């Protein structure tokens, strides 16, 4: 070859089912060996242990680390939607956005990226909680599919769209939903704009909107041609299964205002801690 310059991770995983044992230690007097003095400017956490700062005994502990695994942290059904049919013509088209309730939103926004399968449960009743014999139909409308315009629309023929027929006196319906993003994970934070072009002030709503998370429309109706005399209230619950998560984030200390942006009330900034009077008196 005539041209010689054209010839040309740090850590690994380990299974830790229990917490770490403590070894016995004695006193230590000498120079040069100082495990208590650190340097926080390097960006590294402190590596000082119990046995280097005090005299310890031997503790064989069997405290399990299973519950803090992120599969056990997330596999709990939380509320994502409340849909009402008082919307007086017997059908609702609901655009799927699961960031409307603060408890599951703060848990998921601990991470930046997440990839999971879901399990949706549909708890339906009257607005006062009473149940009546009434037939309903839930339909998932993917993006691009025709959405229903009335109670007797042609889109309720559901020849390819997945649909569930259920009664109100039945147990709540459960379905499994796969991972269906065009990307490799869902992102709760998208720093940018979806399309090209000029970014004027009238189009500032486009900032932060990722189309890889937009999953379509969830439609409900009462099945018959005629109007039902019953009011409907549907509550949707979501379990997160088979989960992978990347890049932990600071947890939010401000109350949520809108579903699509991290906007916060600027006149009342909440402090993260509870205040006291003096630094010396607790």
């Amino acid at each position: 070859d005539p041209i010689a310059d054209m010839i040309d991770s740090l850590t690994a995983l380990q299974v830790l089912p229990t917490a770490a044992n403590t070894e016995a230690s004695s006193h230590r007097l000498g120079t040069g060996v100082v495990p208590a003095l650190q340097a926080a400017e390097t960006g590294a956490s402190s590596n000082a242990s119990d046995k280097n700062l005090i005299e310890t005994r031997c503790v064989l502990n069997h405290h399990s680390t299973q519950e803090t695994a992120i599969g056990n942290f997330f596999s709990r059904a939380g509320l994502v939607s409340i849909i009402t049919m008082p919307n007086t013509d017997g059908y609702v088209n609901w655009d799927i956005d699961l960031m409307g309730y603060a408890q599951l939103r703060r848990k998921c926004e601990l991470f930046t990226y997440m990839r999971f399968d879901a399990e949706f449960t549909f708890v339906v009743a009257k607005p006062n909680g009473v149940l009546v014999p009434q037939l309903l139909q839930y339909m998932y409308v993917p993006p691009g599919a025709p959405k229903p315009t009335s109670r007797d629309s042609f889109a309720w023929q559901t020849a390819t769209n997945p649909s569930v027929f259920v009664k109100m006196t039945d147990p709540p319906a459960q379905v499994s939903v796969p991972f269906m993003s065009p990307a490799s994970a869902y992102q709760w934070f998208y720093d940018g704009y979806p399309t090209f072009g000029e970014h004027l002030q009238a189009n500032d709503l486009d900032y932060g909107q990722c189309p890889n998370n937009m999953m379509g429309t969830f439609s409900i109706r009462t099945v018959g041609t005629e109007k039902s005399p019953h009011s409907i209230t549907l509550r949707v619950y979501m379990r997160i299964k088979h989960v992978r998560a990347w890049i932990p984030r600071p947890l939010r200390n401000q109350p949520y205002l809108f579903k699509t942006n991290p906007n916060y009330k600027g006149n009342d900034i909440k402090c993260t801690s509870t205040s006291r009077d003096k630094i010396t008196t607790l």
Binding site: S9, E41, G43, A185, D191, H199, P248, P250, N263
Partner: protein, 245 residues
């Protein structure tokens, strides 16, 4: 003697004599995209010297009541050099970064800066103050260019998340009695192997004074902060005419 360091890449060299370690973010070095992860079928271009080199931005001035600054990546370099021309002529880009922040002062000055990298730094507003307006940040705020922008409420990082747990991100400190520089090496982090350089920002760099600057009258009162950055494994694909934004 690990307080001295030298970073040489391309035709550029940074020397420092008062340093901490180098932080490698999430324990991963930047790499080119392998064949198993790629999806686009055209051959990408890798310029390898004209784009993988140190770039020095504008210089800030640390005052006694400074709030903090932020930059967006790779928005800081889309108009600079041969990197800024490859990012305009191509549709897709992929690269890691080596960030270096410089701030020196005398042995009679005091203060501490937190230099952190936060991926997908989405900004919020104060919602009109009362919380009733659905306001959105302007285009000069979300992508401020190589100049950068100032933080308005640094305690909530202008996004409703506290500064006190920003150290869960890859970070260093610049403590004026200890060191004068901070160095973080960042890999490529996205849900896609390639992305647009004009529409998407991967991470934000935050420089916030946690302990404020202090000195006695008669010492130097002009304490500047300089940011020097380098792409590492820059790839470009999807060649078409030049698009600025």
């Amino acid at each position: 003697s690990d307080r001295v360091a030298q970073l040489t890449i391309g035709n550029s060299t940074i020397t420092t004599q008062e340093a901490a370690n180098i932080v490698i973010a999430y324990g991963e070095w930047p790499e080119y995209c392998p064949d198993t992860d790629a999806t686009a079928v055209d051959k990408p271009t890798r310029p390898d010297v004209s784009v993988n080199r140190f770039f020095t931005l504008d210089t800030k001035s640390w005052a006694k009541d400074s709030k903090g600054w932020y930059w967006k990546f790779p928005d800081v370099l889309t108009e600079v050099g041969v990197f800024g021309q490859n990012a305009q002529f191509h549709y897709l880009y992929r690269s890691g970064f080596c960030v270096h922040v410089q701030c020196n002062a005398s042995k009679f000055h005091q203060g501490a800066l937190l230099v952190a990298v936060l991926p997908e730094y989405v900004l919020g507003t104060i919602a009109g103050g009362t919380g009733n307006e659905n306001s959105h940040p302007p285009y000069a705020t979300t992508q401020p260019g190589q100049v950068g922008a100032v933080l308005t409420h640094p305690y909530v990082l202008d996004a409703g998340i506290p500064l006190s747990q920003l150290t869960v991100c890859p970070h260093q400190w610049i403590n004026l009695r200890t060191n004068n520089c901070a160095t973080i090496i960042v890999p490529y982090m996205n849900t896609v192997p390639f992305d647009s350089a004009l529409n998407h920002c991967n991470f934000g760099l935050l420089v916030i004074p946690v302990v404020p600057l202090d000195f006695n009258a008669g010492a130097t009162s002009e304490i500047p902060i300089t940011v020097t950055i380098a792409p590492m494994c820059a790839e470009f694909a999807g060649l078409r005419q030049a698009v600025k934004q």
